[PDB]
Design a protein around this ligand. Sequence first.
Ligand SMILES: [Cl-]
Ligand SMILES: [Cl-]
Length: 203
Amino acid sequence: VVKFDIKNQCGYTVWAAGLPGGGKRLDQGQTWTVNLAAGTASARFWGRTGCTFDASGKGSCQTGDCGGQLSCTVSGAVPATLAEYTQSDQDYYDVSLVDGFNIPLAIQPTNAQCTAPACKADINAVCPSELKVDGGCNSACNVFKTDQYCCRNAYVDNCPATQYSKIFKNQCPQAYSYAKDDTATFACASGTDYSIVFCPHHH
Ligand SMILES: [Cl-]
Ligand SMILES: [Cl-]
């Protein structure tokens, strides 16, 4: 298996989520471990804020809600900062803001030979008003839904960065700021495990 250790270092509760994996309530300092069969080709992890769940595991989250479930089986309602992973000849991974921001996030391969990208900045403090929602900051693609921001159709093969994407890129240069951002994928030989941290420390 490939193991992901997902730790909440924020001073607020984060309901972690994974496709695959499900979800887990993480109070400050708690960890969730997710094992992927090493034949698995992909993973998508995120955190959810402002959740309430009943004993049956139904409820709702202010950001990142997955079908009103504690244990996710669908993708999260935008906005939510993403940690993404795929495996082929090696591992490819990234922190992504393409579907918005809610919580700062880092992904750290246990193999120190490989880069550990992070989005550490409080993007919620700087979010333009048209992208702002309670608890997070949407991407221009999710708000406006047009092809220049979403990099579709006439823009699929030639999608320039925009004023909106560059606000995200300023805050978090290592993260995907839009669908075709060319300076946000990192790679590592397969065999490493990973840590994902909400509210990573900064120097
Ligand atoms: Cl666990
Ligand atoms: Cl950290």
